[PDB]
Structure formats: structure tokens, C-alpha cells
Amino acid sequence: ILKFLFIYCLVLLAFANGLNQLYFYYETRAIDEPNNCKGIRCEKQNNAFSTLFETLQSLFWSVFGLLNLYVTNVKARHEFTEFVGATMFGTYNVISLVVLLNMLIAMMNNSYQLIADHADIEWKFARTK
Amino acid sequence: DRIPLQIVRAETELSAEEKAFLNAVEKGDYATVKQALQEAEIYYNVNINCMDPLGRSALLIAIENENLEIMELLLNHSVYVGDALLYAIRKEVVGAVELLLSYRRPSGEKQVPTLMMDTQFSEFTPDITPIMLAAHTNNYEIIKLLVQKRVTIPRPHQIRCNCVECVSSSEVDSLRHSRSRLNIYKALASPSLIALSSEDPILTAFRLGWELKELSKVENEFKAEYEELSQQCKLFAKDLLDQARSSRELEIILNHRDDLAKLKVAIKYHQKEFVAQPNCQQLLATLWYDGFPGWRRKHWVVKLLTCMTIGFLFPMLSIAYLISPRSNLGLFIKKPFIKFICHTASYLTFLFMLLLASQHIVRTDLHVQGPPPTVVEWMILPWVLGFIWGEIKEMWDGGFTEYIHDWWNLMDFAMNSLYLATISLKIVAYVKYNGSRPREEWEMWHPTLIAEALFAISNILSSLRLISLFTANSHLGPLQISLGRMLLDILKFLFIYCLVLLAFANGLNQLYFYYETRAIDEPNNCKGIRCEKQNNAFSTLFETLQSLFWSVFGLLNLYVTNVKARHEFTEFVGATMFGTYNVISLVVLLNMLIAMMNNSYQLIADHADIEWKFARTKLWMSYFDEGGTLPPPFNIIPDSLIQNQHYQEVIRNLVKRYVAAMIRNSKTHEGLTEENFKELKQDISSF
Amino acid sequence: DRIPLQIVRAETELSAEEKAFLNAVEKGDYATVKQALQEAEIYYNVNINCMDPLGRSALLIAIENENLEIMELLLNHSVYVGDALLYAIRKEVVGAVELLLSYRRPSGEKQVPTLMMDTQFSEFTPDITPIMLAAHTNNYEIIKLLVQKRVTIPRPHQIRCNCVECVSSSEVDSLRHSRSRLNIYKALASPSLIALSSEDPILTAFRLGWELKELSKVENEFKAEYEELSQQCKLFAKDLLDQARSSRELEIILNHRDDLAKLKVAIKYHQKEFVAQPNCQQLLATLWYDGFPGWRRKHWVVKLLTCMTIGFLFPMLSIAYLISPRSNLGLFIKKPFIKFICHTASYLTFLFMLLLASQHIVRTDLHVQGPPPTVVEWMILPWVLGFIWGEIKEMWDGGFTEYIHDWWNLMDFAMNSLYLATISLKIVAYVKYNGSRPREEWEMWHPTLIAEALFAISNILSSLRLISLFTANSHLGPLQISLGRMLLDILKFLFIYCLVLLAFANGLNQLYFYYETRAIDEPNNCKGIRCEKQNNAFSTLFETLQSLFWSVFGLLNLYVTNVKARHEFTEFVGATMFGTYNVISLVVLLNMLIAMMNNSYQLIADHADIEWKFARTKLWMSYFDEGGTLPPPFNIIPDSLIQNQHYQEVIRNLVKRYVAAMIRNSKTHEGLTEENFKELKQDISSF
Amino acid sequence: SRLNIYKALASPSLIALSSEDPILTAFRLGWELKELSKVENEFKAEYEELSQQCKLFAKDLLDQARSSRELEIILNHRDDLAKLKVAIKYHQKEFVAQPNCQQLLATLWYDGFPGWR
Amino acid sequence: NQHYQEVIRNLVKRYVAAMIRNSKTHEGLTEENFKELKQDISSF
Ligand SMILES: CC(C)CCC[C@@H](C)[C@H]1CC[C@H]2[C@@H]3CC=C4C[C@@H](OC(=O)CCC(=O)O)CC[C@]4(C)[C@H]3CC[C@]12C
Ligand SMILES: CC(C)CCC[C@@H](C)[C@H]1CC[C@H]2[C@@H]3CC=C4C[C@@H](OC(=O)CCC(=O)O)CC[C@]4(C)[C@H]3CC[C@]12C
Ligand SMILES: [Ca+2]
Ligand SMILES: [Ca+2]
Ligand SMILES: [Zn+2]
Ligand SMILES: [Zn+2]
């Protein structure tokens, strides 16, 4: 798992940098937004790619599906920028949920198959210790 | 009910005298055969060339029983000698093959006795010459004896051959042509024939391995045999390299030319076993850590701190090479490890500055139409030009036929195209979009927005370029090799997934685009799946494709299949379509992809060490040359006969060591038992 | 720097005369030994019991070289004969063991010659008697020869033994006790000793297999050896059954008593290989399809239609058994297949009526506090009472110690408890809740609502009871066997998952329950995660457990970690806790569970045929008896010596066939080669 | 030369003949060969095979015991269970998980509760 | 130390016996038998 999260952290940093670089012009204040809140932890999901920390949080939470789709929508009608941001978000989702997670599944299943033969000796060694 | 059993294909039954003669031959009695041969000459009782039903002849049975005196008497009395040499060669006995080779010319008088109908059965195909079968059996002594008698093998043609004789032979009889080519390549790929009849066994093994791999790619039917022959050639080259005993022999082998020329040839021919041999890896490690002796013995703290300071000294030690290449400080950059660390530090600095360009400290006054570049972008532009010049230099040096085989140069080309695009869009927006119009009323297709979008995509590609540095580490190399194989499996899967997605998107759009609504009628003046309330999702083909893509991750809600009017049947049919697509793409296809990459990971995990070492060698030798010494921020700032004699002297010892290492590992239980039984029988008979 | 190599444990070096004597012994010369033995008697030059450093003696070397005349001369001249019988037995030669057995009593005069310090080395432990080692080697002739001479083996005690001698021997020397018990059980589990010294080899094999499995469960250290011995006993029983040649022998074996008594014994001892043997399966299939000959040869359409009509004739043919058991129609229910189909049809009718009870056609006037039962429920009540009476009858017959081992009776007990609970709640709500109060103002703890909830849970259990019918089919049997094993793996996983869930729920509740709000302040007067707007999710331990359970399936939103005030640090820490729990429970633990059940499926897929056949046999023999003929809607409506002689006659032929089938498959390449070499050497020496 | 020397020193017969403490010698050579396998990248398989050979030699030499007194003499020998602590320190998993050592450790663990199994 | 060396003597000698008897294989026994047969035939 640690060997996998090295690559996942690299990919997450890359896509968070790309999304934040595209999107932080459209940051809004908490007063203009409803309920005086700003972030992805609101009832209506506010600006999610306005800071590097907020982009990292949003791209982390998007793996479990708790990040909605309308976070890639801006106030003005910049359809090309919205489409490019949605393409970036979709590519990150495809990687982190179709490639990387299934590779992690295959990796730990292979390692479980190698470790299941010697599962008796090391358990007895740990119990003796 | 009594199924009748009868010999439906009845051979001619042997005569009683013939049965007695071959029974005497297989008995091994020397005295009884001679009276039979004299009476067959005089009285013509026994045809000497008779044939028992299980495919054997008296000479041929004497070959199997390896008795030489019965051989000599029979062949003195003129048995048909043809096709018997192949059985002796397959028997792998020196005495029989020497006896039939020696007595091919017994001062033959009146040509040969006539024969009719006895060249019916031969276990070997007519294209098999004795040298080819000797190479197939891979026995050193028989091959040497045959080669000493001036024998030849036909040369196979090119794979892409269109001459008259190859086309005519393939058209008339394709099976004979394929068998002949496979037999010729089996004869040429034997280690003994390469060790005996080629002056450069390593280069010959490399070329035959590459040719057999290409034939395996072309010829679909004999793929397994050609792959086995290529593997045999590769392991022969690896063993011949492995028989070395000193570093001087290893560096004579590797540096031999027609610096490391033979290693470059081996990499060009994809010889992974030759490259990943431990002594070659040790020599490459000693060349890689040129200025840092004992790098493996250091504690990781001082290794890490040395890397820390030599990475942080990246603006220095590169201008020193510019101002004084011959100084003690100037020569310290020419070593490959310092080159690699300086390039890595330069790329990390580039990524850090692209990270810093996305902050509010630098970015000011966003409400200008065409903005002048900020001080961060003015400083960035030399690294972009350095990457451009480095990729241009890599495109000229080495050739266009080698620049495209790396498969990382496509990513660099996309990076360069995006950087040129964003530079061009910024300069055109500077020169002819003067103004300060606020961003809320800009054109969708404003070139500033296109420039920023392409800049963001180039940022992602630049930050994802760091995958290629994983072979330098000892833990992330085989991991990305498995990534590379399973990515091909992913592409094979997305072919089927794209077909299914296109089918269901067409079906949903065909059902649903009547109920498209305008953006004015819908709340918040928005139209699409990227709204707070998910609007019409199946109203255009592009929108249907987007919705069916986003439905895999669960970000598409269920009420997108609901229309304004109360058409319950149409809504139910659309929901059924959406449910069927979800069942396929989330229960069938994804789990099949899981099983596919897990199976491929299980096959690739056995060889995860050799290909990682091959990739690490290919990365190491990229820094050995002097072309590309400077980092990207600074690269734009303005006798052969003696070597042949030594190589042949080394190859003599290596080949002789390898042939000794084969014979002693070739004597097995069965052959030793057969030799002991034959010796015991001979001693008992003589006594 | 010259590591000194020296013999640090130096044996006493042999004398030159001793070296000559043992060299003459290993040479095999008969003449040279005799003068040495006479001179050792007269001149006392050679100690006959001397010991070369590699653990051998002159008699013992003569044992390894299997020469009998040197044996006879040495043992005539009084070599120490002890411990040599074990080496002869391990040599597996009849002549040597017969010679040492015969000359144990050479009319011994003046006891034995004295010996000091030569019982130092024995390759065999002192607890090994010759019969035990003969059983260990598993050779028929040596075992027979030893048994013919009145030999005994000690009886092992019970596993749960607490007598004085077992406790004292375990306390003083546990290793010797464990080795002795393992050696005794290895001697008793050999097929030859069971075939020779037990009058009921099948029952003895069953009992020893069960005892060895129980010892493997108890003794942790020798689990592999005891499991191997149990497997050896099971395969011996399977082979002895497999050596049958006729149906009369098979039905004599299966029906032998101390109807199918031995099959019931085999099922009780969990002999899966004995039960799933093909001829026993054929006999059970012929008994199962008693009234339908040629059921396997029919096309599936007529088989399906026959099942269709005999399932639809379920109310008939059961009352016919009540009114006329001796009629032609009355006897047709006693066959097992018709019993199984009628029980399945009754259960399907019960499930269909529970489905029909949930419709608006029957249910009327929901606004009564205590409703009288409707006509559907009045009709249902006899099936519930029939299930009760059937489970009561199954609890008495067979015993309480067998009713709990099925593991399906827990589900039936839960079903029965729920049915009694809902019946009691309905009758109490009838008798003392008279009224017509509307449902919107009922008490939370109203017994009518509790009755309906328990009725729904009983409905789910009744409909999920259909899993147990999967062994009757040929495709769903091994599938649910794999389900059964992987469910145990699931329980092993949910132990760790429950621990992690409890930890993170405690952490979140400890952080968050200050900010609990009342239901009045929150919108729609609701409080919990089951609202339209997700309310406080970490305000109680139960609510935190529910929220962290529902977060695995993604049904818990992200804004549950937001509080009313602007405590950004507390919100961030809670979001970090929630994210860490999500990472664990969805990236680590679930994928580990995937890998675990995939690995267990790979191990269980090899044996998926035997255990399915065992489960199908256990289901088939449940319908063979006459107890439980009627369906649940109708079950409440008011000489031994001749058999022993035949069994022993069959066992004689079976055991003799099995021992012949072992010796011919016991002659191997190595033994035949050794015998041929010994015969050739003997013939050459004699000539 | 180094690989040949370590192959010569790791043979069971030479340890049994030329070392007065075969168990401790097997432990130390196994640890040294494992450390050499960690350091030397090229001969990792050979050094790991030699370390495994030393570990199984120590396990077999322990397994050739015949009585509890011999086992407790072996385990409690010093230069209480000193040799078991040494084996754990050298990561000898096959030596520790041998069944008779596990039985002795189980009897020491259930000191006041006889017949716990 | 004396008791330990006394135990190691028996353990090492048992282990070396357990190797030689499991070291005699089919091929070595066949080679020895063939050599003995050839020597006996030549001597006779
Ligand atoms: C974990 C998160 C914060 C992302 C980090 C991204 C980068 C800062 C990492 C990812 C890949 C790393 C590289 C992976 C492997 C190596 C090889 C490593 O050298 C060796 O392994 C020694 C042997 C040799 O290569 O000769 C030196 C560090 C370096 C360049 C690493 C430098 C730091 C990199 C670029
Ligand atoms: C697919 C959906 C609609 C759920 C259906 C549930 C039931 C109607 C099914 C599930 C399990 C089925 C049973 C599975 C296996 C069998 C055995 C089958 O008989 C055989 O396989 C012949 C050999 C033999 O058992 O002797 C007869 C039908 C039956 C009872 C099936 C009857 C129909 C059942 C109860
Ligand atoms: Ca490049
Ligand atoms: Ca029951
Ligand atoms: Zn041609
Ligand atoms: Zn007792």
C-alpha cells in the first residue's frame, strides 16, 4: 500500500496543481456565497479548486464519490474553461478509480498468494516474541 | 454384437528366411549373418534390403543396437546405405557416424545394385541433410566431424522476399517451404554450430535472435517454435558472457567494435538477458558512480545528504563547465551520476516554479484583456526554450528513426506543442487585445483563456513526466514495468468499453432528444449535467456521452431520466437502458478488467527483475555521452586489428569453457547407463 | 588470514587391523573374514563390535550390502545382535529379517559377551520396536513375518487423559512422550497393518482417521503429520471400497451392521472420499430415483414437465397417504424424489402466499389498533404450526446432540421464535387494544408495529431459507460450498473491521458530541442521518456507529462534519478523521478481503466436487427414512451371523485384491535395478 | 573469490566438522550472508540461498534432538533461554518455530495451568 | 560447556548419519554397482 501511495501522491499533486492553476481566478468570498461558508464541507458545494489545499482536499474526496460534479461550474459562462476543467477531473477520476485502485488490488492479491505459503512460521515467531 | 477386428492396411508379410535373417541381426550373432549374406549372393535367398513392418532395416537395426562389426559386414555386402546416416546421427554415437562417413567410397564398382520400392519409409523429411540433423541434436563431436568434411547449409532468404523462386515454391508447396525454413533456422540456432562455424558468436547469436523474433512476429503458425529458438539464442549469448573470469576479459568483450559498443548493440537487439547479467551490471555501476567510490557501503544518511547538497548546487557547477571545462570543478559535472542529479534538480526546480506561478503573491490585476507576462513567466521562459532546444538536439542526433522508439518523446512533443501554443496566444493577446475589460463579459473563445487552459494541461504533463525517473530507484522500477504492461491491458479493455458506451449513448439519445429544453426555461440559466439541479442529460450525443461517462463514478443522479410530461413508458424504458448500461459497465466489464490485469501481473511478476535492469541500463547509458552535459536552463547559453586479435583470443577461451560446461552437464543417467551396459556386454562377449 | 580448520570433535581413530577387517567386510570376500574372526578369538586382535566413524558396524554393513553368508559367519562368531533388526527392516529385504529373527536363539551359552561403550549410536529412537518400524515402512511381507511371531504394539491413551502415568511422563519428558505417541499412531495407521490385524478394516480406518483428526485439532505442533495420517487412512478406506467388482459386494459392504448403516457411519465420521466414490453415488442415485427408472436418459423437457405436474399435485397425494397408505396412489409418496419435490412445492407455496399477503387486495382498514387476522393469515397459520411441529419432531428424534450440528437449525429456530413472537403480539393486540385510532398517532412501541416488523424479518428468513436446496442441482452446489468457506473468511475480516469501526466511532463521538442540537431547532423536526438534509451524525455513539457504517456505501454526505459555529480547526480534524476511516475501510480492508476470498477460492476450487457430493448425499439420506413423509401443511393432521459371515467373505477378497494392487504398484525402477544388480553379482560370483 | 569463500564456509559438513558451536556459527553466517545479500545487489540470489541453507542446517541440527533434557541444554546454553534470545536477535524463524521449541515455550507459558489444551 | 559439547557430539553425528543415508541416490548406487560388476568381471 505504501509503494502504491507514492505513485498516487505524485498523480494527486500533478492534477491538483493543474486544476488550481486553471481555476483560482474564480475564487469567491464567503459573504457572497450562501450560508457564509466556503469549501467542499457545505450543503451546497462551494469553490473546490480555488486554493492548492482546497484542490488537494477535493481531489482526495473525489475518490470516494463525496465530491459532486457542479464544483467545476463557474459563475460566468466560460464554457471552454468549464469543459477543460471537467476533462481534467474526469481524467483524474479515470486514473485513480480504474487504473490505480485495480493495480493495487492485483498487487496485494499477488503478494497475499506469495505470503500465504509461509503464514505459519512468521506467526509462530511473532507469538514467541 | 461382435465388432469385426481385422488388419485393414496389411503390409506384405515377411518371408521365413527374411525373418530368420533380421532375428539373427537383432540377436547380435556375428557368425550367423555371414553365411546368410554369402547364400543371398549365391542362392539369392534373402533380399538384404528387406523391411520389417515396424519401420526398420538390418543395417538400421544394427545402428540401433550400435554394433559395428555387423555394420561393417553388411555394408561390405552392399546394403542400401542411403538415409542411414540420419539414424546414426540421431543415435548420437561417434563410431557409427564415423563408420558410415568413412565407407561412403569403397571403390564402388558397377554403380549401385538396383532397388525398387524400398525408399518408401524414412522417418526424416527429405529436406533434412546430415549437418542440419546434427545441429538439431546439438552434439559437439558429430557436428565437428561433419564440418571437418566440407559440408554446407542453404542460406534462408529475407522474411520480406518477393523473388520468383520463393514465390513459386510457396505457391506450389507451402508446407514443404515452411518446414524447410523452420529446419534451416533450427540448424542455425544451435549453440554448437554458432560456437564452431562463426567467428563472432555473440554478434551471430544477437542477429539470429532478432531474426527469429521477427519471423515469430510475421509467421503466425510457428510462433512458439521461433520464440523458443530466439530464447535459446539469447540464453546461449548470456551463458557465453557468463563464462568470463576477469574484468579485463569483460571489458574486452563489451568494448569490442566491428565506448561500450557491444552493449549498445545488445540494447539495440533487445537482449535483456545479456544486459542484466551481474558482471555487466557491476561494470555499469562502477562507470555510473565514477567519482563516488564505495557508494553502496555508505549509510543512507550520508548518501541522502550528499544528494541533498549536490541537488541544491544546481545553478553552480554548470556555469563552471561554461567558464572552465578543464578545471577540477569543471570536470566534476561530466560524471553520469552528477549529470543525473543535476537534471533531476533542474526538473524539480521547474516544477516548484510552476507551483509558485499559481499563487496570489505574483498574480495581480486579473481584469486586463491582454496581460504582459509576469516576472515568474519571464523567468520561466528560458527553461521552456531549453527544453525546446534539448528536444531539437535529441531529434537530430541519433536520427529520426530512433527518436520515435523511446515512447516518452510523444509526451515531450505534446508538452512542446502546448508551450508554443500558449506562448503564441499570450503574444497575440498582448499585441492586439489592448484593454481592461472585466472577465465576467469575455468571449468564450478568448485566446487568453485558451492560453491558460493549455498552460494548465502542459503543467499536468510536466508534473506527470516524473514517472520516467522511477527506474533509478530499486523499488519503483518493476512497479512501473507492471504499470506499462497493465496499461496495454487497459487499452485492450477500453476498446470494448468505448464500443459499449457508443452503443448505449446512441440508444439513449435516439430515445430522448425530443424533450430537449432551452436554458432560459430551466433554473439558473444553465443546461447540462454540470449544474446544481441535473438538467437534460440525454438531449445531444455529446451530452449523452458525457452523462454515460460520468455515470460510472456515480456522479450522475437518477432523476436525469425524468421528463416534464407524464410519459411513464418512455421514462421506464430510458431507466431500463440506463440500468442495463450500469450493470454492464460496473458489474461485468470492470471486474473483467480486474481479473485481466491481475492475471497479467501474475505472469509479469516472475520476470520483473530483468526488464527493470534493462530499463535502468538504458537510462544509465543516456548520461554516459557528452551530448547533453548542461541542464535545460543552461544548454542554450552560447588499431582495429589489435582489438580483433584480443577479442578472438578471449572468444577462444570463452567458447572452449562453454563447450566443456555443456559436455559435463550433458552426461546424464540414461546415457551413462547405456554406455555402461554396452561396455559390460562388449567385455563379456570378448572374454 | 588463514582461518584454522581442524577436527574439533575427534572420534577415536580406527586401528589398522580394524580398518582391514571392515574393508574386507565391505569388499564382500567371504574367505578373508573367517581367519580374522578366528584370530580375534584366539589372539584378540580385532574387536568384532568396532565402529567406523560414519555410523556403521560389520554386521550392519553386511546388512546394507545384503550378503547373508557374511551375516551368518559374523553372528556365529557372536556379534552384538541388538538394534540390527531395525536396519534390516528399513532395508526391506526378507532374507535378512528372516535370518536375524531365526537366529535370535542359537542355544546361547554363558549369557552374552560383555560390552562397554558401543551402544552409543543408534539411528532409531529407543521407543521403536521392530513391528512399529515395519508398519512405518509399509511392507506386507515383513509385517506378516513379524505378526506371525506373536508381537504387540502398546495402546495409546485417550487424548483427554488425566491419569497419573500419562501426566508424569508428560511432565518428566514431554518430547519422548510426543514422539512415542506419534510413532504409535504412525504404526497403527499403515494400510498393511489394518489389512492384516483388524477384522473390520473399513471401520478401523474410519475410527483411526477420526482419532487422528481430533489429535491434529488438539496437538498444535504435529498438525501436519496427524493430518497426513488421517488422509492416508481415508484414502485407504476409499481404495478398499474401490476394489469392489459387483453390486452385490457393494450392497453387502454398505448395508453391513455391527438400511445403509455403514454409509451413515461414514457420514458421521466425515469420510468424504468414501461417500463420494462413484459406485456408492450410483447406488444412491438408483435408490433416490426409486419410481422413475432411466431419469438420466430423458430429455430435459419431459423431466421438467414431470417435475411441473408433480409439484402442482402437492395438495393431492398427501391426503391420499392419510386415507390409504397401502394403495397404489398412497405408496407413491414414500419414494425420496417425490418427497423432495413435494416439500419443495410446499415451501414454494408458502413463499408465494407470503408474497400474496403483501398486496392491497386482501389488506383492508389499516386504521384499527388491534386487527383480527385476515383470511390469508388464517390460512397461513397451519403452515406455521406445521413447521413448528416438524422442528419439534426433528429435535426429539436423532437427539439434541445431532440437531445442533446441522447449522441450518439456527435459522429455523430464529424463524420459529419470530413466528411465535408475532403470533403472541397479534393475539395480545386483539384482546386488549380494542379501538380504531389512526396510525399517525400510535405509540412507537405499539405491539402491532413490533409484530409486523418481526413478521417482515421472518419473511426474509423464510425466503432466504431456499439456499439449502442448491445441493440438489449440479451447478449450484460447489458454488454454495465456496460461499460457505468464503463466509468464514468474511467473519475473520469483520472482526478487524468491527474493531476499526469502534475505534473511529469513539474518536469522532468524543470530538463531536458537544454540538448536538435538538430536533425542534433543526428543519422538518428530524434528527439523524435518515433525513433529507443530513443532520448531526456524530452526536451519539449509536449515531456515530450508524454514520460510519453508512459511509462505506457512500450514502453519508460530506457536510455532516460541519458545525454551526466557525470552529475551523475542529471541523478540519473531524474531516481528517473521517477521511482516514474512509481510506482504511475502502482502500485497505475491502481490497484485503477481495484478495483473501480469491486466495481461498483458488484453494477450494480443486476439491469442489467431493464436498458437494457429500452434501448432496447428506440431503438425499434425509428423505430415505419414513419420519417426515407428510408435507408441513399435513404433518399435524391426526440373522446377524449370516451378515457377518458374508461381510468377512467380501472383506477377504477386497483386502487380498488391495494388497495385490499395492505390491505390483510397489515394484519401482530403483528396486528392480537393485534386485537385478544383486542377482547378476550373485550369478557371476557363483559361476 | 568472496562468493566462493562464503559458499565454502556455509556448507553444513564444514560447520559440523570445524566449528565447536555449529548452531551459533550457523546463526552468524546466516546473518552475515543476509547482510551481504542486502549490500551486494548482483549476487542477491546466491547469498539468499546460502543464508537459507545455513538456517535449514541449524533447524535440522535442532530437530535431531531426542529428549527434553537435550532440548533444554541446547536452548539454555550461554557463551534463561539465552540461545533462543540469540536466535530471535538473528531472525532465525525456522529455528524458533520448530515444534519442540514451541512445546517447551508453551509449557513455560502455561506455568500454573497444566493441561490447558 | 561440557554438557553442551556432549549434546552437540550426538546431534552432529546423528545429522551426518541422516545425510549420508539420504545422500545415496539411484544414480550413485547404479554407478557403484556398475563399477563393482566391471571390476569383478575383469578380475575373474
Ligand atoms: C511524495 C510526493 C511528495 C511526491 C514527490 C515527487 C518527487 C519530489 C519525487 C517522485 C520521484 C522521486 C525520484 C525517484 C527516484 C530517485 C532516484 C534516487 O536515487 C537512487 O535510487 C540511487 C541509485 C541510482 O539511481 O543511481 C534519487 C532520488 C530520485 C531522483 C527521486 C527524487 C524525488 C522524486 C522526483
Ligand atoms: C430466479 C428467481 C426468480 C428466484 C427463483 C427462486 C426459486 C423459485 C428457485 C431457487 C432455487 C430453485 C431450486 C434449485 C434446485 C432444484 C433442484 C432441481 O432438481 C435437480 O437438480 C435434479 C436432480 C435431483 O435433485 O435429484 C429441481 C428444481 C429445484 C428444487 C429448484 C426449484 C426452484 C428454486 C427453489
Ligand atoms: Ca526526450
Ligand atoms: Ca430443520
Ligand atoms: Zn527469395
Ligand atoms: Zn493415561
Author numbering:
A (entry chain D): 517 to 645
B (entry chain A), C (entry chain C): 16 to 273, 286 to 665, 705 to 753
D (entry chain D): 195 to 273, 286 to 323
E (entry chain D): 710 to 753
The article reads:
Like many other TRP channels, TRPC5 is permeable to Ca2+, with little selectivity among monovalent cations, and functions as a thermosensing channel. Here, we present structures of the human TRPC5-Gαi3 protein complexes using cryo-electron microscopy (cryo-EM) and demonstrate that Gαi3 can directly activate TRPC5, increasing its sensitivity to phosphatidylinositol 4,5-bisphosphate (PIP2) using electrophysiology. Remarkably, Gαi3 binds to the ankyrin repeat edge of TRPC5 ~ 50 Å away from the cell membrane. Electrophysiological analysis shows that Gαi3 increases the sensitivity of TRPC5 to phosphatidylinositol 4,5-bisphosphate (PIP2), thereby rendering TRPC5 more easily opened in the cell membrane, where the concentration of PIP2 is physiologically regulated.
First, we used the human Gαi3Q204L construct, and recombinant Gαi3Q204L was incubated with GTP prior to complexation with TRPC5 to maintain the constitutively active conformation of Gαi322. Third, to facilitate membrane-associated interactions of the myristoylated Gαi3Q204L with the channel, we reconstituted purified TRPC5 into lipid nanodiscs. Each protomer of TRPC5 can bind one Gαi3 protein; therefore, a maximum of four Gαi3 subunits can be occupied in a tetrameric TRPC5. Among those, the complex with four Gαi3 proteins showed the highest resolution of 3.54 Å when processed with C4 symmetry. Remarkably, the Gαi3 proteins bound to the ankyrin repeat edge of the channel, which was ~50 Å below the inner borderline of the lipid nanodiscs, and the solvent-accessible contact surface between TRPC5 and Gαi3 was approximately 690 Å2. The conformation of Gαi3 in our structure showed a typical GTP-bound form, i.e., the α2 helix was well-ordered and adopted a parallel orientation to the α3 helix, which was also supported by the distinct GTP-like density at the nucleotide-binding site of Gαi3. We observed that three TRPC5 residues (Ile57, Tyr58, and Tyr59; hereafter the IYY motif) appeared to contribute significantly to the binding. Even after extensive 3D classifications and particle sorting according to the numbers of bound Gαi3 proteins, the four molecules of Gαi3 from the fully occupied TRPC5-Gαi3 complex (hereafter, TRPC5Class1-Gαi3) showed lower local resolution. In contrast, we observed substantial structural changes in the cytosolic domains, including the CCD and the ARD, when TRPC5Class2-Gαi3 was superimposed with TRPC5Class1-Gαi3. First, when viewed at the bottom of the channel, the CCD was rotated by 45° in a counterclockwise direction in TRPC5Class1-Gαi3.
